Amino acid sequence: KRPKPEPPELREVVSSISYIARQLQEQEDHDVLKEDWQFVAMVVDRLFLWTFIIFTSVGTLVIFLDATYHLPPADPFP
Amino acid sequence: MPLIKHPEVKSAIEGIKYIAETMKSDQESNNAAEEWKYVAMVMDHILLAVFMLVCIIGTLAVFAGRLIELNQQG
Amino acid sequence: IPCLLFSFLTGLVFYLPTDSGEKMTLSISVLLSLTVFLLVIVELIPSTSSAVPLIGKYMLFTMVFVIASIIITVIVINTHHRSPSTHVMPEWVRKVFIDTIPNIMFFSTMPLIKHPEVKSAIEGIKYIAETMKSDQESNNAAEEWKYVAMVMDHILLAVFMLVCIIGTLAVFAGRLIELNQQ
Amino acid sequence: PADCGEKTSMAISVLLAQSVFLLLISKRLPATSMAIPLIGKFLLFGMVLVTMVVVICVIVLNIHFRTPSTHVLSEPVKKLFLETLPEILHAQQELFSELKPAVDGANFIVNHMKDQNNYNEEKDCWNRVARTVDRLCLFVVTPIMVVGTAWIFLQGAYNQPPPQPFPGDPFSYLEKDKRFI
Amino acid sequence: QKCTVAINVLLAQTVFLFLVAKKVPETSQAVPLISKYLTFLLVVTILIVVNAVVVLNVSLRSPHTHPAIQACVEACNLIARARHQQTHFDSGNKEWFLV
Amino acid sequence: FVFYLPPDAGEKMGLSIFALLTLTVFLLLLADKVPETSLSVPIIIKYL
């Protein structure tokens, strides 16, 4: 589950503050794209965890059952 | 890829201008840093394919020279 | 000779800063090299239990030396990430590691427009200033612990090099002087 | 620590050293099945313990690096791992026409700072929970390892030959106890 | 990852010590050429690790060890002063990095 | 469990490759014990 629900003196001051606001908005947008990529990375990681568990269990079970069910013959001369 | 003009007020104005200029310089540096990062990314994307191709080709060149002979003899 | 080189490498981790993120790599890899060299030694040295060989004493000394280096490095690294949010600096640590020792070294102790939006901006500027004031205070508190870790690193670099030399001599010097005095 | 201390590398390196010691031991004994060697018992126990510690370190790093944008910090979980267990273990519009961009921008900066503060505080809370779990695992795992090591080695430390060569025979078969006719 | 690379190279060289340990003659009139060369390579790797530690120490040396308007202007001055301090800190760190 | 490790911890490659290195050490362990014939592959080598 993703948490995210989706005068000459003062003119320079106003323009500067506008620049800081624009810079922080750009940083926020870059952050949003970064969490999108990171969330897809996490989702792919969980999918790979589950299929790795499945492959591990299946292969280990097949090999272990092949080893376990190899018994000596009851008759020396079949 | 109308003004007080006290030294504190003027210092505050200069400080805001300084924040803006410092952030401008930081962005300008980050742009060229990202350019170098992109170049390194492109070389990585090329050399992944080059190295996978070499991994296939060298193994085949080492072993096929005798395996194809062993296939021909029989 | 390889045991001597590993013993020399053992004390090198105390000059490596903790901010490199490589202290544990260095120490653990020295231990791994020593463990792999144990194969060489079990191959090359007789397996007799009548007495401990002198060379075997040197081996055990070097092994214990590396393990002690790893333990002490864990202590230093734990000290270096102590923060005001989690730990309070004891007075004895400040008395010893800041003033008593570093004084010997050469570093640093280290009109009315009231409106719902305008008033919000005023209070927000004040809040930002207070926030970064608190951040500066916490940063200084962390730098204190960092300085403590740096001082311990210096002292224990000196101690480990000294003990490396002394333990190289203490295992070997007796028989060597006996041989030379023939 | 979970930020400068590479925990899983250290743990898997301990596992590697244990494997090298198994390599050393494997050449020196016959591959019989009457019993497991005592050193073999200790090595198997230690390798299982190191595997469990690696799993614990992975879980603790999963706890440490959680963020608000990825996980929700539940109040019962936070209260359990931050309060209980830490204790247990231990005119006037021409002017406004030009100042409105400034006021709007400044409010945006303040909101951005507040959001970053909340984000970092939640990161710190997750770090504290990870540290609490680590301290609990320290107080659990280490006594188990000490007890298991002592139990394994006290079998061999107290293993002695019997005082008589033959159970059921009280004769010592020594020169001094020679049996005349 | 300087120290990782250097020390892992040293680990590989120790594996090589084990490989040659089973092949060199065991007399003591002279040191074999291969043994001399492996010892030299070991010592070179040790010196590389020493220099890596020294260079990282030098590079990571932080410089610390080598009405309401009158309140608003104070807060803004404090903010600007803190940012200037941070910029000076960054400049010092860069200087140590270049050294 | 490498897939449960966060990417931000920066310890995935280390864990996985050192697991591979330990596997190679156990291959070295097994090299002294296995039969050297080529008519089939032992099941333990298949597992390894």
Ligand SMILES: *[C@@H]1O[C@H](CO)[C@@H](O[C@@H]2O[C@H](CO)[C@@H](O[C@@H]3O[C@H](CO[C@H]4O[C@H](CO)[C@@H](O)[C@H](O[C@H]5O[C@H](CO)[C@@H](O)[C@H](O)[C@@H]5O)[C@@H]4O)[C@@H](O)[C@H](O[C@H]4O[C@H](CO)[C@@H](O)[C@H](O)[C@@H]4O)[C@@H]3O)[C@H](O)[C@H]2NC(C)=O)[C@H](O)[C@H]1NC(C)=O
């Ligand atoms: C080191 O290694 C050596 C062996 O290499 C160990 O020596 C052995 O010690 C044990 C215990 O002391 C001995 O067992 C006893 O044997 C005697 C003698 O009986 C034997 O000889 C008889 C003829 O002289 C023969 O008839 C016996 O056969 C009968 O009995 C056996 C055993 O019950 C049975 O299997 C047969 O079918 C027969 O019925 C036998 O060959 C015997 O008197 C002892 O009896 C004790 O135990 C029984 C219970 O098992 C009990 O009921 C009795 O009251 C009594 O307490 C016992 O069986 C063994 O013979 C020795 N082996 C030899 C001599 O080579 C030595 O102990 C080791 N040292 C260590 C480990 O410290």
Ligand SMILES: *[C@@H]1O[C@H](CO)[C@@H](O[C@@H]2O[C@H](CO)[C@@H](O[C@@H]3O[C@H](CO[C@H]4O[C@H](CO)[C@@H](O)[C@H](O)[C@@H]4O)[C@@H](O)[C@H](O)[C@@H]3O)[C@H](O)[C@H]2NC(C)=O)[C@H](O)[C@H]1NC(C)=O
């Ligand atoms: C262990 O190895 C042994 C060999 O080293 C295995 O022994 C072989 O077992 C098979 C199957 O039991 C035998 O083959 C059988 O032989 C009988 C007898 O053949 C003779 O009589 C018939 C009569 O019509 C005649 O036609 C033949 O020519 C012979 O004269 C057949 O009746 C069966 O159909 C079958 O062929 C082998 O003979 C036997 N070899 C030896 C040398 O004893 C043994 O099975 C192995 N044990 C295992 C695998 O557990």
